[PDB]
Structure formats: structure tokens, C-alpha cells
């Protein structure tokens, strides 16, 4: 039960954008320019990590 | 100086407008990034029966 509960929380924890406009890498680069898009993902990898 | 202030949609979903964009063959289950009317996604796309 503990192992299963922890595993799901590790999958549901892909939700929060972590203080950015978007909460999905796929759309971060599509609608932003690295100069201003990279700082957005700065809190995404920093969040998932 | 005409200072008439206008305002379009502010972060709303697609509507009766369609920008000048082309079309291409869709992706069924390919594990690649996709584009369908702006929205972009990656990973693996799997078909369910919902």
C-alpha cells in the first residue's frame, strides 16, 4: 500500500506548472522563445527534479 | 490621436476564428511531439475506449 501510494504521487506530481505560464514542456518551447522560454522551464525541471 | 482601446480574447480556447495555417497527416499512436491547433505535446499517445 505504501509503495503503490508513493508511486502514484510521483505521477500525479506532474501537475503544478511551478510558477510559470504553462505546466507542460511540450508547449513551453512551442509558444515561447528560449531567451524568455528557458527561464520558464527553469522552474519545470527544477520542479520535477 | 485616436486612443480607442480594443481588446481581443485573453487566454481563451479556439473559437470561430482560424488563423492562416496549413494541415498535415495526423498521428495515431506515434511517440512524438504533436501539433493540433497550437497545442503541443510529447511522450506516447495511446488510444482508449472512453
From Swiss-Prot, chain A:
Consequence of changing residue 17 to K: In strain: Omicron/BA.1, Omicron/BA.2, Omicron/BA.2.12.1, Omicron/BA.2.75, Omicron/BA.4, Omicron/BA.5, Omicron/BQ.1.1, Omicron/XBB.1.5, Omicron/EG.5.1
Effect annotated for changing residue 29 to F: In strain: Omicron/BA.1
Name recorded for this polypeptide: Spike protein S2'
Organism (species): Severe acute respiratory syndrome coronavirus 2 (2019-nCoV)
Function summary: Subunit of the fusion protein that is processed upon entry into the host cell. Mediates fusion of the virion and cellular membranes by functioning as a class I viral fusion protein. Contains a viral fusion peptide that is unmasked after S2 cleavage. This cleavage can occur at the cell membrane by host TMPRSS2 or during endocytosis by host CSTL. In either case, this triggers an extensive and irreversible conformational change that leads to fusion of the viral envelope with the cellular cytoplasmic membrane, releasing viral genomic RNA into the host cell cytoplasm.
Coiled coil, from the record: 1-41
From Swiss-Prot, chain B:
Quaternary structure annotation from Swiss-Prot or TrEMBL: Binds to host ACE2. RBD also interacts with the N-linked glycan on 'Asn-90' of ACE2. Cleavage of S generates a polybasic C-terminal sequence on S1 that binds to host Neuropilin-1 (NRP1) and Neuropilin-2 (NRP2) receptors. Interacts with host integrin alpha-5/beta-1 (ITGA5:ITGB1) and with ACE2 in complex with integrin alpha-5/beta-1 (ITGA5:ITGB1). May interact via cytoplasmic c-terminus with M protein. May interact (via N-terminus) with host bilirubin and biliverdin, thereby preventing antibody binding to the SARS-CoV-2 spike NTD via an allosteric mechanism.
Region feature (Disordered): 12-34
Organism: Severe acute respiratory syndrome coronavirus 2
Function statement: Attaches the virion to the cell membrane by interacting with host receptor, initiating the infection. The major receptor is host ACE2. When S2/S2' has been cleaved, binding to the receptor triggers direct fusion at the cell membrane. When S2/S2' has not been cleaved, binding to the receptor results in internalization of the virus by endocytosis using host TFRC and GRM2 and leading to fusion of the virion membrane with the host endosomal membrane. Alternatively, may use NRP1/NRP2 and integrin as entry receptors.
Residues of the full protein shown: 508 to 557 of 1273
Gene giving rise to this polypeptide: S
Lineage per the UniProt record: Viruses, Riboviria, Orthornavirae, Pisuviricota, Pisoniviricetes
Entry protein name: Spike protein S1
Amino acid at each position: 500500500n505504501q509503495n503503490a501510494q508513493a508511486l502514484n504521487t510521483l505521477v500525479k506530481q506532474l501537475s503544478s506548472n511551478f510558477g510559470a505560464i504553462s505546466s507542460v514542456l511540450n508547449d513551453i518551447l512551442s509558444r515561447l522563445d528560449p531567451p524568455e522560454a528557458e527561464v520558464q522551464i527553469d522552474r519545470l525541471i527544477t520542479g520535477r527534479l | 490621436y485616436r486612443v480607442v482601446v480594443l481588446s481581443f480574447e485573453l487566454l481563451h480556447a479556439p473559437a470561430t476564428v482560424c488563423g492562416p495555417k496549413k494541415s498535415t497527416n495526423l498521428v495515431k499512436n506515434k511517440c512524438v511531439n504533436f501539433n493540433f491547433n497550437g497545442l503541443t505535446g510529447t511522450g506516447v499517445l495511446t488510444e482508449s475506449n472512453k
